[PDB]
Amino acid sequence: QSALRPVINLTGTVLHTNLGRALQAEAAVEAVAQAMRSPVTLEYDLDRGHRDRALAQLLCRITGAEDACIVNNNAAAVLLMLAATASGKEVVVSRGELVEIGGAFRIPDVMRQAGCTLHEVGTTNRTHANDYRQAVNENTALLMKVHTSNYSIQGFTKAIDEAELVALGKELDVPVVTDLGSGSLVDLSQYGLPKEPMPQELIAAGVSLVSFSGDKLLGGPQAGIIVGKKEMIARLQSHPLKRALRADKMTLAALEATLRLYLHPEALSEKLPTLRLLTRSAEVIQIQAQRLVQVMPCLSQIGSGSLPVDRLPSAALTFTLESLAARWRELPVPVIGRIYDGRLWLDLRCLEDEQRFLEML
Amino acid sequence: QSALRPVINLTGTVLHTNLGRALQAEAAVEAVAQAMRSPVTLEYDLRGHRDRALAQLLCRITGAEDACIVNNNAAAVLLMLAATASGKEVVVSRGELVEIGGAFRIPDVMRQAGCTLHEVGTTNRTHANDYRQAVNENTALLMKVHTSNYSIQGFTKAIDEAELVALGKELDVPVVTDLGSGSLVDLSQYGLPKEPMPQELIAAGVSLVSFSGDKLLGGPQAGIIVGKKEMIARLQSHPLKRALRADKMTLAALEATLRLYLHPEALSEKLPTLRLLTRSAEVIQIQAQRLQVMPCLSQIGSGSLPVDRLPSAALTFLESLAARWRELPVPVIGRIYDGRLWLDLRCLEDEQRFLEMLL
């Protein structure tokens, strides 16, 4: 058996960064299979033709931006954005937005790689608009707002919103870019989940470029999507780095099929596996746990793109340890649970097929 | 009536930074009055230094070799940086560059103190290798700042003081700490959130620890630096110290407050800050009923996380009412929330005056 084997994610973290993040929809799977099995017009426009013009039009329809650019991932998106829009110049970032994701991604390190100069303003908790204003000079190329997707600072805090920073950049003739990261395309508060900033809101507020992932709250493939001004995007596409960061035909097919799900929001909670697992009701989980060793309430973390706070009720079955987990990790379809509160918990929020799962245990 | 008139703090914030922060004990008041009325041996050893006996008291309580006392903890940090790291780099985590109140800001304080701020790691996740890579021949300190007014939650990582002390010992670089809150007792014993103590930092091997005296300590506005005798002697000999030296009222209040910590069992009663913090919710409910009344939540105040953590009971009654109350000789300050005016009764100790004044 290969190491890329299926695994039943019962840890309660739906968007596990180490387990492939978001599961893709059946439409995305079918589009990917069709693109793999048969030749597709990747860079051959029937009407030469660019690689992601259809994707750019779809993203213009959804978010409302002028143009779009697709790269390997959001780390590549930030790298390309900084290298093509702020190379050799300063970038002003709040001292409380210098984010680290996972461990391999660090904003100061990305600025070092991209050839920019990181200008840090304000403090970790309190950043004021005057801190941004005092740092803008002739060498400043961007005002960068990074969305702290994996952490939140609580207490005595102050952050300048994107509208204020866009107004300040318009006054000082400095573009404002955003590393949104999570890239939730719908209002999560409608589904009872915590609200996250949307690319539509940032695009409407006047942000020149907004970069977000595709495997996070978007529910698609690993991709880095940069949407915004036509001039800025055209700068990105013409950069020498883009050839290294361009997106595969499987990635483009999955991304387009996923984005077409957002054109019919009524079925979005059903067609999108990420949303279906996130908005799964707790009563159904309780019933499934009882049907399938004690069942008690647990809390499930959303995963990547959202704050690691659990914030989601669920029901889990517990085994009342280390050797049991080791034995479970050796199955043809490994079952990963969590050693929480001295017990082995199997959160049943992400268990979609009970018939298959019950065979291994 | 002056602008420093008494005010009945019913906002639920016990340690209101804009309202004098911590209230002082009766022993502190008596010692202050005694030093106020009569001459005291401020610099006359029965010459001796200004704060030798108070440094002895701090050594007894915390366990440090020596101690220095300045105007406030902002002055403590400024003097520490200007006397131990002037002209040299200081390594501070990128997630500890803190702003307190609005006038105190770590990068600006380091700029004023003549040091070079070296920022390591990221805002949420700082590793020990980030500290290690920044240490060079120009590095003078590894500074750990306690984020007293905020907490970063989520995917985070902070290097504790023990690891940093070990790293500095390996690299021959001293480690200092801007503790700030300066809680001298384990608050978890009273059901309150635990906060780092100067005793723990001094035991762990931190060269210098600076904390306030009006925060969780419950004394006067003072900046107390405790640590190694050599670095303290560097602080006391700095030109800045003369500008930052502490008043005789400050020293009297600080000693009378610190002497309460030598009698821990009565500390929950003789310390007004602790007495208001450990006040039971049932008594507040009874007092509110005697004086609508519904549950509310109260903040600890300065030095702790600004979160409505402590259960309490509030009396509710809008903006014109607050404006009329602010005209009173003994003003009553409440909070406007949910279209209602709330008075938290956790911090109310004299119900007779408040009842007479409201009626």
Side-chain angles (χ1 to χ4, degrees), chain B residues 30-323 325-343:
Chain B
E30 214 33 63
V32 160
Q34 151 216 297
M36 270 209 69
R37 280 199 261 267
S38 63
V40 291
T41 57
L42 194 47
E43 281 209 310
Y44 196 107
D45 208 317
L46 307 165
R47 70 181 69 190
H49 194 220
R50 190 172 265 220
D51 46 48
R52 206 41 65 240
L54 195 41
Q56 172 183 4
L57 198 45
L58 277 152
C59 166
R60 205 192 312 202
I61 291 170
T62 63
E65 302 183 15
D66 211 358
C68 178
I69 308 193
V70 293
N71 181 32
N72 48 26
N73 191 27
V77 178
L78 165 77
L79 182 62
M80 225 168 46
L81 288 178
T84 58
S86 187
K88 306 179 183 179
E89 293 175 350
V90 184
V91 176
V92 193
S93 175
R94 229 179 280 269
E96 289 162 343
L97 305 165
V98 60
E99 157 163 341
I100 289 95
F104 184 87
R105 165 169 286 187
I106 277 292
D108 301 9
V109 152
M110 305 201 56
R111 197 165 306 114
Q112 179 59 38
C115 315
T116 302
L117 161 64
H118 204 125
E119 306 146 29
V120 301
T122 51
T123 299
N124 53 323
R125 181 154 278 257
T126 302
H127 310 285
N129 217 327
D130 286 312
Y131 284 102
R132 176 172 279 111
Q133 300 304 323
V135 174
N136 61 90
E137 337 301 325
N138 301 332
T139 290
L141 301 163
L142 306 179
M143 208 214 183
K144 264 209 78 74
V145 185
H146 180 239
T147 76
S148 58
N149 51 341
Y150 73 93
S151 77
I152 306 181
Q153 293 188 358
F155 188 61
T156 49
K157 171 81 174 297
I159 298 307
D160 270 88
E161 275 87 6
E163 287 163 284
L164 214 55
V165 159
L167 193 143
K169 282 174 183 172
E170 140 180 311
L171 296 181
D172 211 335
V173 171
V175 168
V176 295
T177 301
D178 179 25
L179 181 76
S181 61
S183 66
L184 286 186
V185 289
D186 213 0
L187 289 186
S188 69
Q189 312 219 324
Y190 302 106
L192 278 95
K194 182 182 180 180
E195 313 269 317
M197 308 177 342
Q199 301 94 312
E200 302 176 338
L201 304 183
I202 284 290
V206 179
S207 298
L208 284 171
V209 177
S210 77
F211 54 99
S212 283
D214 41 351
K215 247 114 150 219
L216 292 166
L217 201 145
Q221 171 185 292
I224 305 148
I225 315 163
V226 288
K228 304 296 165 65
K229 183 150 262 143
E230 48 270 12
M231 329 198 48
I232 288 290
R234 289 178 77 179
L235 303 194
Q236 315 260 27
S237 62
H238 202 268
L240 263 176
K241 171 79 170 98
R242 179 61 166 81
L244 313 174
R245 73 159 44 167
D247 182 22
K248 77 173 178 182
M249 296 204 264
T250 292
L251 293 177
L254 198 59
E255 210 214 43
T257 294
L258 284 181
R259 284 219 189 292
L260 303 180
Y261 287 87
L262 301 186
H263 197 152
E265 59 93 19
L267 185 60
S268 67
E269 199 61 63
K270 289 179 146 352
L271 199 68
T273 288
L274 204 48
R275 182 179 65 236
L276 292 174
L277 257 49
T278 82
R279 189 182 178 185
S280 81
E282 295 91 5
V283 178
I284 306 172
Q285 183 88 14
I286 295 162
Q287 189 207 282
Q289 290 163 352
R290 179 167 46 208
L291 294 179
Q292 296 173 323
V293 170
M294 326 148 264
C296 73
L297 297 166
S298 310
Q299 272 181 39
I300 292 181
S302 289
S304 294
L305 256 291
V307 278
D308 269 46
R309 214 172 287 200
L310 266 86
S312 192
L315 150 69
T316 62
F317 285 77
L318 204 80
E319 63 275 13
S320 293
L321 179 53
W325 278 348
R326 279 187 268 128
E327 291 173 355
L328 271 48
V330 188
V332 175
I333 306 298
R335 263 160 51 244
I336 295 172
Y337 184 78
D338 203 30
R340 303 168 182 177
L341 193 49
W342 300 60
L343 270 49

Side-chain angles (χ1 to χ4, degrees), chain A residues 205-249:
Chain A
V207 180
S208 299
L209 284 172
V210 177
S211 77
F212 53 99
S213 280
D215 41 351
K216 287 203 183 123
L217 299 168
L218 202 139
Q222 169 185 289
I225 305 145
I226 325 160
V227 291
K229 266 39 189 273
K230 190 141 261 152
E231 280 186 1
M232 303 234 69
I233 291 292
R235 288 181 79 177
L236 302 191
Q237 314 259 26
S238 34
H239 201 269
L241 261 175
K242 173 84 172 97
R243 182 59 169 72
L245 315 167
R246 67 166 42 181
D248 184 19
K249 74 171 177 181

